[model samples]
Every structure is written in C-alpha cells, then in structure tokens.
Target: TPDREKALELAVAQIEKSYGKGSVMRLGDEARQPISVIPTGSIALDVALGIGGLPRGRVIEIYGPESSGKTTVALHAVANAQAAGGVAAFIDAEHALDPDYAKKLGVDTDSLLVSQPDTGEQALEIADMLIRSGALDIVVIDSVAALVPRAELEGEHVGLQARLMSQALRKMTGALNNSGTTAIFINQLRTTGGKALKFYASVRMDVRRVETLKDGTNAVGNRTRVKVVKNKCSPPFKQAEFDILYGKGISREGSLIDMGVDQGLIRKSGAWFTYEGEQLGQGKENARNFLVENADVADEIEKKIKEKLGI
Candidate 1:
C-alpha cells in the first residue's frame, strides 16, 4: 500500500509541475462542503429546502410566470443576507427592481449595490466582477429574459441573447466556485430554453400563483407555490406555499399555518381548529391570531417542524 501511494504521489506531483503549483491533489484534499445557506426568508420554503436556504458559492435559479413572486423570493434572500451583515448586489437588467418595495421587505437599501446594465453582456460582466471581487456575499440578477444582447438591439442576430447567456454563464461558474458569493438569477417561464441555466444552477425553484387573497371584496394578496425542481445541497422536488401579501411580502402567519398543517401539529374540522389536543379557535384567522398571540407555542411547533424535516 505504501509503495502504491508513493507512486501515486509522484504522478500527482508531475502533473502539478507541468500545470502549476497546487494544481493537482487527491480528490478529497480540500473538499468544500455545503453547510451554510442564505435564508429565502419564508419559513415554509426554507424548511422545504432542507438546508435552511440556498447554498452559498453556488448558482441558483428561480423561474416562473408573471406575478408568481419570483423576484419577491430573491429580494427576501438579499434581505436575509444583509441581515447577517453580508454585502449584497443586484443587477437590475429588467430595470424594474423596486427599491422602496425591497426596503419594506427588510432589505438594507443603503448598502445594497444596484446596477441597471444596458445589455446582456454588461449585466453578465457586472455579475462577474461582483462575484469575483470577493466583497459581496450574494448577487441577484432581475430576470434572464430581460438580458438583451447588444447585437439584438439592431436586429442583427436572432438567438444572440441565448448564446451570450450560455457563454457568459459558463465563465461565471468558475467565479462562483472560487468565491463564497451566492448568485441568484431570476427568470421568467419560457418553454424549453435556457438550457445553460438549468445545467449550471445548483438549485432550481419553480414558483407560481395558486390563489388570490381577498378581504371584503377587495384584492389583498396571493398565495404562491414553490417547488424545488433541482437541488444539489438537499433533497429535490420538495414543495411549499406561502402568502405574498401586498406591501408586506410573505406573511409569517400564513407560513406558520402551512407548516403546522404539514406536520399534523395543527388541525381543523369544519370551522374549529385544534393543536396538540387543544382547541386553538374557530376559523383560520382565529387560529392565526392564537399562534401569533402565544409565542412559546409557536416556537415549540417551529422547533418540531425543523426537527422532523431534518434541518
């Protein structure tokens, strides 16, 4: 065994000398494990991820139809990264990133770096610079569909946008692997395209609007459904739903109800609600209020939910 190991070491050293110092080593010499995450800011989604959030130093994609709260989810992650005293940047290629709304969602606007690039090349280059700078903890691009190529502005090339994305993202994968910054790309639902994104993203989430909340015949918010289509840090295909309340973002009470029911820690029969062999109240609103009023019970239930999910 020792003779074989020495021979292997000599072969590795030979390759390293030809390439460069530290270029060759055993596969497990300096393994970078995925043990940290930037929370998505929704309890249900975070729990469903099973890692508490998106894995750092990796590429993540969130794509869905319009009004599906795709951008909302990314902003929540940015806010969360900032909460941990980490730097954040946003490449607003869509030119529609709402600073006011981001602030309301708990993002630290004062420290966030916002850039509105004119072309796909500019946007991707900006992302590359930020990620490789080793100063940012997370970078978000508004939407992939918005990254228009400079050549496309004059109608020169038909598929230049996709080509540019494919090439640019290929380079970004190296930067992502070398840095600790998490890159989140927001995208719209397109039919069978952007294969590069699908191939490179460590995690892919598909979001959609399932129902709208109403109060006294007035539209308030909508319930959004998220399904983890792909995951590298945890189990894939896990789904979660949370309410996207207008002006307030994801509702804590809504997620609590969803998580509670998911674990069978809370139950309902017709109009009455029960939890842990005790009646909470009548109606969903009453149950929400009961959980909100009792802090200890809510914490207890949340702990159990995390424990059950292996978080």
Candidate 2:
C-alpha cells in the first residue's frame, strides 16, 4: 500500500514538473479550463455581463414581469447557439412558449427542441437529459414560476414549495455544470420577494418594462432596462439598456448612439452628428440614414464603436 501511494505521489511531482502547478495532465489542467461564453449578440448586454455573454457549463437565470421581454432576451442566446452550429432546447412549462416569435428572433426552430411538459419535475428531467447528452449546446426552461408541482397538478396541492424546488434545482445544476452545456432558466418573482434559481445561476438578470418610446399619438416600439442581479462572469449590479422597434428585434442602437456620442465616437452640437465635414454625415438621424445608405463608412463607425466599448 505504501509503495502504491509513493508511486502516485511521484507521478504528481513528475506531472507538475512538466506542466506546472494545478496540473493533472490529461485528467485536469488550468490550460484546459478556459472560460468560454456564448454572446446574446446584443452588444450592450454582452458588455454588461462582463464575460462577453452567456457562458457554457453554467446556469443563467432571466426573470421579469409580464411583457417585460424576458423571453425575447433569453432566446437571443439560444438563437446564437443554433447559429454557431449547436443544438438548442426550450422546455416550455407555461404552455405559452411561442415558436413563431422565436423564429422571428432568428432562431432556427427547425433545429431546436421545443417541449411543453406538464409539470416542473418533468421539465427538469427533460433538461437534465439534454444537458447530459452533450448533444445540445444550450437548453432554456421558460419561467420556473409557471412550472407545476406534481402534487398540485394532480389536484393534490396547489402551491410552490421552496424545499422541493430547491433540491430539484441542485440536481439540475449539477448536471449542467458537469458538462459543457449552457443552460438558461426563465423565471418570475414571487410576492414573497424570493428569487428562484438564484443560488445556482452564474448570472441573474432582472428585466423591467421601460417607458415606450413615443412619436405623437403613435408608439414606435418599446425599450427594456435589464439590471444584473448577480453576475459571476463580471461584476454584479451593472445595468445595460436595450430597445426594440415595432416588428424589429432587440437592438442597442439607441444605447449605442447615446454611448457613441457620449464617448466622442460621434460628434454633435445640436442634433447634428459627424460635423466631420466629410463622408460620415452630420446628425444622429443623418448618420443612421447615411449608415444604410453608405455602409462603407457605416461599417467603419460600427467597428470603431465596438472597439471603444472593448467588446
């Protein structure tokens, strides 16, 4: 026994000598632990999350009130995963999950698994299978608050129980983190001020309905303010603003324009932009119009803006 233990100790020393500290060669190594993230493709939110975007091998929770655009945001990442040649799954517990809207968001619905399980426990089981299979890159569960406990669903009990939900979550978390799959759990706030999936999630975002942008007796579209509740990828409590126009998807163009002006990426003195006395154009609206009109210069500005943002 002593001989065997000594051999193992000697093996560790040899591995460390070759690979440095915290090395187990093929078994474990810091070099193999790089943090990878799947960005939502929403520039503003990407910067807010600090690690660039949603990270694989960790749970992410997004929650808000009705029409708060929570689903819209989470789907961005799921869509992104599909775009990168990885499969995605959406466990729709509320039975309100919309495939058409997800399609509008650029999600390849044809490659996604959209399931409407009757209870929370079943949803968890479904998500666990997807994560463990390692076949899917990301899985999303739509709103935990809507998930029904079996007892209640069977006309037994009619309430949310913390302990039952908590234990189930621990297992779900273990399955996700142990693999390379990324997970998103859509949730809602309870009247008791409790945050579901809060403990297991690496990032928690609270979406709020911001005032709708108006244009004289008509509404152009709407905006949302997403506050970071907890972010393991970046610092916590940072806020990012994003908006969408009617029939359009989420865009940080408003924040981008404001931030661009704020950061001097664009110059203005009155509603006028550029003032460069050159091809870049000379107004907020001017550049916006000029951008699509002259994308050559537009691409330059967008590049410079993202460069300034360090994203």
Candidate 3:
C-alpha cells in the first residue's frame, strides 16, 4: 500500500549494518535463547527448579546455616556434571572440603580439580580463569563468607572486601554469559560482604533446617528444605525438601513422594496411595518403600517429571 513493509526491512538492515550481524531482527526471526540444564542431583529440587536442573552459563548461589547441607548440595551438583562427562572443579576457600566425604557422595574426587586459595582475590581470579577457559562445565566456590580480602587480614581495612567482591562479580557476570560453565557459590547465612553476589546471582537458593533426626538423644541426621528464593532462569519460590543422614548423604526416596504428590503424579485417598492410576500402596511409608524396591517405576516417574518441567 505505502511501501512501509520494505521500509521496515531497510530499518532493520541499517541497524544491523551499524551494530553487527544478528544484532537486530524481527521478533519472529529472532532465535530462541539456547539453554542447557545440569542436574542438581536431587530430582525433587530438579523438578522444583522448573527447568529440571540448574541452568548452565549463569551464576547460582546456595546459602544456609551451618550443617544445613548447602555444601553437600553443591558437591552433588558437581558430581552430576561429572557423571554427564563434563569437567568440574571446586574452589575451596573455606579450606574444609573433605575428599573422602565427596567420594562417598559419588563425586569423582580423583578427576575433580580442587583449589584452596589463601585469599579471596585468588579465589575470584581462579574462578574467572576456569569460567573463561571454556573447558570446564561446573565450578563451585565453597562458602562466599570465607572469602577474606588480603587487605582486611593484614590491616584495619574496612569495606575493602565488599568493594573487591563487587568488582569481581561485575566482571564474572560478563565472563559467565556464554562460557558454558555453571559457577556455584556457597554462602553462609547472614554473612556480610555479599551485596554484589546477591545482586548478580541468576539463581539464589536458600536452605533451611526443618527437623533434626535423632536416635535416643543422639542426633543422627537432619532434614532441610531448599527454596528457590531468587531465580532468573525460571519461576522463583519453588521448594524441595530432603533428608541428610549423617553417614549416608542425601536420602532419595522421601522427596519422590513429595514431588509426586505436588505434581499429581501420585494420588492419595483414605490412607491409600495411587501412582499412575494404579494402587501404589496403602500408606506413605509403604508407597516410599514400593518406589525404593521397584526402581524402574521411580525412573518412569522421574522421566515424567522432567517432561512436565519442560526439560
């Protein structure tokens, strides 16, 4: 009618010429953003994430109080990445990573690159290098609270660590955009000097201790609830609950029932439970044992969960 359609094409071409190719395009012509999700090791948490796992090439934070199993979750993420034939590393600023414990939880400790940096600056530099190398799939920093700047330890330098953290995070954010590496930062509850870390994290999952597992005045384990308080990759406020046995790592059976009940995959009526339109068991404990014994059924449900989560 008025040659306006051709003019629109001209406008887009002019912008692309000035900027760069593929920099501007029509909404329909624009490509969808590519996303790769690495498993979080817990199917319950994976489903709760809405992406079935943590999205790669982004910054994620896991924070909780002591003994809340935050570190364990991070390690599990590393193990999952390794299981997928991806390289993984751990930057232990807290100097508390136990190799034996990690091995017990299925982590390939022998192949994992472990770095114990003396200062916060060294840790950030190491993380930046690993992320930019394009050779690693996951890098975990144990406890951001332990990142102490060299200036603070040597003298009375106030606000130095926060400023350094802010600077590092700003650069790390850019480095992580297309690096194919998931940088996981473990933070302690209520620790100071993480204003930038909080702001830059694409996903911030908090761990809360819900109940203590005790056996006749002897504490055997504990149960913790993980909540996605801030997530840029998917919907926020999703939660998953799991138990942490002292000697044994994360228990897998309990969360399956909770996830199933949440997603309508498992049904309940008058103390009896049904899964996939069949009678699973009579009680919750019975249902859990059934899934434990019949692991193939559990795998089927896990597959369905991923499908529903849009994985």
Candidate 2 yields a Cα-based lDDT of 0.71
Give TM-scores for every candidate, taking all chains together and pairing residue i with residue i.
Answer: 0.81, 0.78, 0.81
**Cα lDDT, all candidates:** 0.82, 0.71, 0.80
Clashes of each: 0, 2, 0
> What pairs collide in candidate 1?
none
Candidate closest to the true structure, highest lDDT: 1
Q: State candidate 2's TM-score.
A: 0.78
lDDT of 2 at 306: 58
The runs of at least 3 residues in candidate 1 whose Cα sits more than 4 Å from the true structure, single-residue gaps closed, are 1-34, 154-156, 190-193, 267-281, 290-297
53-158 in candidate 1: lDDT tens per residue?
8888889999998888999999999999999899999998677777798899889999999998888899999899999999889999887888888987755667
Off by over 4 Å in 3: 1-34, 190-193, 214-220, 269-272, 277-286
Name model 2 segments beyond 4 Å from true. Answer: 1-35, 157-160, 190-196, 275-302
RMSD of each: 6.9, 8.3, 5.9
lDDT, candidate 2, 122-201, per-residue tens: 88888888888878889998867777778887877334655556777788777877778888888776422234467677
The alpha-carbon deviation from the true structure for residue 297 of candidate 2, after best TM-score superposition, in angstroms, is: 5.6
TM-score of candidate 3 against the unseen true structure: 0.81
Per-residue error (Å), model 1, residue 168: 1.6
